[PDB]
Design a protein around this motif. Structure first.
Motif, PDB file in Angstrom:
ATOM      1  N   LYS A  43       0.820  -1.213   0.000  1.00 53.29           N
ATOM      2  CA  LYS A  43       0.000   0.000   0.000  1.00 53.29           C
ATOM      3  C   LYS A  43       0.855   1.264   0.000  1.00 53.29           C
ATOM      4  CE  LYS A  43      -3.835  -2.387   2.312  1.00 53.29           C
ATOM      5  NZ  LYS A  43      -4.625  -2.569   3.571  1.00 53.29           N
ATOM      6  N   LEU A  44       1.951   1.271   0.763  1.00 50.74           N
ATOM      7  CA  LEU A  44       2.803   2.456   0.801  1.00 50.74           C
ATOM      8  C   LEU A  44       3.523   2.671  -0.524  1.00 50.74           C
ATOM      9  CD1 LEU A  44       4.397   2.375   4.369  1.00 50.74           C
ATOM     10  CD2 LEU A  44       2.490   3.762   3.531  1.00 50.74           C
ATOM     11  N   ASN A  45       3.945   1.585  -1.179  1.00 50.60           N
ATOM     12  CA  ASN A  45       4.593   1.728  -2.478  1.00 50.60           C
ATOM     13  C   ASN A  45       3.623   2.284  -3.518  1.00 50.60           C
ATOM     14  OD1 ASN A  45       7.202   0.925  -1.787  1.00 50.60           O
ATOM     15  ND2 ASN A  45       6.755  -1.252  -2.118  1.00 50.60           N
ATOM     16  N   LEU A  46       2.369   1.811  -3.505  1.00 48.47           N
ATOM     17  CA  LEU A  46       1.354   2.382  -4.391  1.00 48.47           C
ATOM     18  C   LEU A  46       1.133   3.858  -4.086  1.00 48.47           C
ATOM     19  CD1 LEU A  46      -1.282  -0.502  -4.523  1.00 48.47           C
ATOM     20  CD2 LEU A  46      -0.140   0.524  -6.483  1.00 48.47           C
ATOM     21  N   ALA A  47       1.045   4.206  -2.801  1.00 49.69           N
ATOM     22  CA  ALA A  47       0.825   5.597  -2.420  1.00 49.69           C
ATOM     23  C   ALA A  47       1.999   6.487  -2.817  1.00 49.69           C
ATOM     24  CB  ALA A  47       0.563   5.686  -0.918  1.00 49.69           C
ATOM     25  N   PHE A  48       3.232   5.994  -2.654  1.00 52.33           N
ATOM     26  CA  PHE A  48       4.410   6.800  -2.976  1.00 52.33           C
ATOM     27  C   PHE A  48       4.409   7.234  -4.437  1.00 52.33           C
ATOM     28  CE2 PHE A  48       8.849   7.323  -4.306  1.00 52.33           C
ATOM     29  CZ  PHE A  48       9.285   8.258  -3.377  1.00 52.33           C
ATOM     30  N   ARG A  49       3.973   6.348  -5.338  1.00 49.66           N
ATOM     31  CA  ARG A  49       3.910   6.713  -6.748  1.00 49.66           C
ATOM     32  C   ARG A  49       2.743   7.643  -7.050  1.00 49.66           C
ATOM     33  NH1 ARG A  49       3.584   0.350  -7.270  1.00 49.66           N
ATOM     34  NH2 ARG A  49       5.769  -0.237  -6.874  1.00 49.66           N
ATOM     35  N   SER A  50       1.750   7.710  -6.163  1.00 52.58           N
ATOM     36  CA  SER A  50       0.468   8.343  -6.446  1.00 52.58           C
ATOM     37  C   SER A  50       0.358   9.779  -5.952  1.00 52.58           C
ATOM     38  CB  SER A  50      -0.661   7.548  -5.780  1.00 52.58           C
ATOM     39  OG  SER A  50      -0.865   7.993  -4.443  1.00 52.58           O
ATOM     40  N   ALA A  51       1.244  10.226  -5.065  1.00 51.91           N
ATOM     41  CA  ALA A  51       1.048  11.506  -4.406  1.00 51.91           C
ATOM     42  C   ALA A  51       2.375  12.235  -4.264  1.00 51.91           C
ATOM     43  CB  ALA A  51       0.404  11.331  -3.021  1.00 51.91           C
ATOM     44  N   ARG A  52       2.285  13.565  -4.170  1.00 51.95           N
ATOM     45  CA  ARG A  52       3.482  14.391  -4.048  1.00 51.95           C
ATOM     46  C   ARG A  52       4.205  14.169  -2.721  1.00 51.95           C
ATOM     47  N   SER A  53       3.482  13.809  -1.657  1.00 47.34           N
ATOM     48  CA  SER A  53       4.079  13.515  -0.357  1.00 47.34           C
ATOM     49  C   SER A  53       3.261  12.401   0.269  1.00 47.34           C
ATOM     50  CB  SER A  53       4.034  14.732   0.590  1.00 47.34           C
ATOM     51  OG  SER A  53       5.025  15.702   0.269  1.00 47.34           O
ATOM     52  N   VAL A  54       3.935  11.399   0.829  1.00 47.26           N
ATOM     53  CA  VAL A  54       3.298  10.382   1.661  1.00 47.26           C
ATOM     54  C   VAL A  54       3.843  10.546   3.070  1.00 47.26           C
ATOM     55  CG1 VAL A  54       2.916   7.944   2.094  1.00 47.26           C
ATOM     56  CG2 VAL A  54       2.983   8.794  -0.280  1.00 47.26           C
ATOM     57  N   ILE A  55       2.950  10.774   4.031  1.00 42.76           N
ATOM     58  CA  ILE A  55       3.316  11.094   5.409  1.00 42.76           C
ATOM     59  C   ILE A  55       2.975   9.908   6.307  1.00 42.76           C
ATOM     60  CG2 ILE A  55       2.947  12.659   7.336  1.00 42.76           C
ATOM     61  CD1 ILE A  55       4.288  13.916   4.836  1.00 42.76           C
ATOM     62  N   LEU A  56       3.946   9.473   7.107  1.00 43.28           N
ATOM     63  CA  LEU A  56       3.738   8.464   8.139  1.00 43.28           C
ATOM     64  C   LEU A  56       3.669   9.168   9.482  1.00 43.28           C
ATOM     65  CD1 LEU A  56       6.288   5.561   7.168  1.00 43.28           C
ATOM     66  CD2 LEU A  56       4.103   6.199   6.131  1.00 43.28           C
ATOM     67  N   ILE A  57       2.604   8.916  10.240  1.00 36.90           N
ATOM     68  CA  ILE A  57       2.410   9.482  11.578  1.00 36.90           C
ATOM     69  C   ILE A  57       2.538   8.338  12.584  1.00 36.90           C
ATOM     70  CG2 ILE A  57       0.932  10.898  13.053  1.00 36.90           C
ATOM     71  CD1 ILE A  57      -0.528  11.820  10.488  1.00 36.90           C
ATOM     72  N   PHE A  58       3.509   8.434  13.497  1.00 44.87           N
ATOM     73  CA  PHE A  58       3.893   7.313  14.353  1.00 44.87           C
ATOM     74  C   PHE A  58       3.253   7.380  15.735  1.00 44.87           C
ATOM     75  CE2 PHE A  58       7.356   5.306  11.989  1.00 44.87           C
ATOM     76  CZ  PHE A  58       7.601   6.259  11.020  1.00 44.87           C
ATOM     77  N   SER A  59       2.835   6.217  16.245  1.00 50.87           N
ATOM     78  CA  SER A  59       2.371   6.109  17.622  1.00 50.87           C
ATOM     79  C   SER A  59       2.796   4.773  18.219  1.00 50.87           C
ATOM     80  CB  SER A  59       0.850   6.283  17.714  1.00 50.87           C
ATOM     81  OG  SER A  59       0.389   6.032  19.029  1.00 50.87           O
ATOM     82  N   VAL A  60       3.396   4.829  19.409  1.00 50.13           N
ATOM     83  CA  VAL A  60       3.774   3.632  20.153  1.00 50.13           C
ATOM     84  C   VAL A  60       2.568   3.158  20.953  1.00 50.13           C
ATOM     85  CG1 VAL A  60       5.282   2.726  21.967  1.00 50.13           C
ATOM     86  CG2 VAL A  60       6.194   4.343  20.260  1.00 50.13           C
ATOM     87  N   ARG A  61       2.209   1.886  20.781  1.00 53.90           N
ATOM     88  CA  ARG A  61       1.046   1.334  21.466  1.00 53.90           C
ATOM     89  C   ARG A  61       1.177   1.518  22.973  1.00 53.90           C
ATOM     90  NH1 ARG A  61       1.908  -2.324  17.434  1.00 53.90           N
ATOM     91  NH2 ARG A  61       0.300  -2.558  15.818  1.00 53.90           N
ATOM     92  N   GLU A  62       0.073   1.918  23.603  1.00 51.58           N
ATOM     93  CA  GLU A  62      -0.060   2.185  25.034  1.00 51.58           C
ATOM     94  C   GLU A  62       0.601   3.483  25.494  1.00 51.58           C
ATOM     95  N   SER A  63       1.286   4.223  24.613  1.00 52.51           N
ATOM     96  CA  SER A  63       1.934   5.450  25.063  1.00 52.51           C
ATOM     97  C   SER A  63       0.954   6.601  25.231  1.00 52.51           C
ATOM     98  CB  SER A  63       3.003   5.914  24.068  1.00 52.51           C
ATOM     99  OG  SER A  63       2.421   6.256  22.811  1.00 52.51           O
ATOM    100  N   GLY A  64      -0.215   6.533  24.590  1.00 55.73           N
ATOM    101  CA  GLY A  64      -1.150   7.637  24.642  1.00 55.73           C
ATOM    102  C   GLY A  64      -0.741   8.846  23.836  1.00 55.73           C
ATOM    103  N   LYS A  65       0.212   8.686  22.916  1.00 55.59           N
ATOM    104  CA  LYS A  65       0.771   9.820  22.198  1.00 55.59           C
ATOM    105  C   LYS A  65       1.169   9.393  20.795  1.00 55.59           C
ATOM    106  CE  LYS A  65       2.952  11.812  26.353  1.00 55.59           C
ATOM    107  NZ  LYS A  65       4.291  12.057  26.955  1.00 55.59           N
ATOM    108  N   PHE A  66       1.290  10.388  19.924  1.00 57.80           N
ATOM    109  CA  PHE A  66       2.057  10.255  18.697  1.00 57.80           C
ATOM    110  C   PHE A  66       3.481  10.727  18.975  1.00 57.80           C
ATOM    111  CE2 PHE A  66      -2.327  11.442  17.520  1.00 57.80           C
ATOM    112  CZ  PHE A  66      -2.677  10.417  16.670  1.00 57.80           C
ATOM    113  N   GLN A  67       4.454  10.107  18.301  1.00 58.04           N
ATOM    114  CA  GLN A  67       5.865  10.425  18.527  1.00 58.04           C
ATOM    115  C   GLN A  67       6.489  11.266  17.420  1.00 58.04           C
ATOM    116  OE1 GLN A  67       4.718   7.278  19.547  1.00 58.04           O
ATOM    117  NE2 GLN A  67       4.722   8.099  21.630  1.00 58.04           N
ATOM    118  N   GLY A  68       5.740  11.603  16.384  1.00 53.83           N
ATOM    119  CA  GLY A  68       6.231  12.457  15.325  1.00 53.83           C
ATOM    120  C   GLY A  68       5.691  12.009  13.993  1.00 53.83           C
TER     121      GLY A  68
END
Length: 154
Positions: A43-68
């Protein structure tokens, strides 16, 4: 400011990345790489060819937060001592290495996951454009980042 950030996010696609532990996110922040299971790699490889920017938003399970969040700079390619079958390695440029608590994104719903709060989603869940843009704009500004070089990759 926020203007170069908004430019990078224009017409982007966004994906929620869930990790079981902080060590893997720390490695990704240090080395500028990510790897995922084949179903999401395709899915990410398809998206990379399809859009000017593909953004990954990270979250560690149980942390209650996104990390960047980070932007794909390549498709996957086929070593990294992850704390666990995986696919290839994506190169990524970090856009923000600061945390955001889930309490701050409680007003954002993701149409592509039944309008559930954006924090809710399996690893690889796509986040609709407006929801993903507003989520990225909520993070604290990361003054260590210069988006000039990222803009040149587009």
């Amino acid at each position: 400011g926020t203007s170069k950030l908004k430019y990078v996010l224009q017409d982007a696609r966004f994906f929620l990345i869930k990790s079981n532990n902080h060590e893997n996110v720390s490695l990704a922040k240090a080395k500028g790489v990510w790897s995922t299971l084949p179903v999401n790699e395709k899915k990410l490889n398809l998206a990379f060819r399809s859009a000017r920017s593909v953004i990954l938003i990270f979250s560690v399970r149980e942390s209650g937060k996104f990390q960047g969040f980070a932007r794909l700079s390549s498709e996957s390619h086929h070593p990294i001592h992850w704390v666990l079958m995986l696919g290839g390695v994506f190169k990524i440029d970090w856009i923000c290495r600061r945390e955001l608590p889930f309490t701050k994104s409680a007003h954002l719903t993701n149409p592509w996951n039944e309008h559930k709060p954006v924090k809710i989603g399996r690893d690889g869940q796509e986040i609709e454009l407006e929801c993903g843009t507003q989520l990225c704009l909520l993070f604290p500004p990361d003054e260590s980042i210069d988006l000039y070089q990222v803009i040149h990759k587009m």
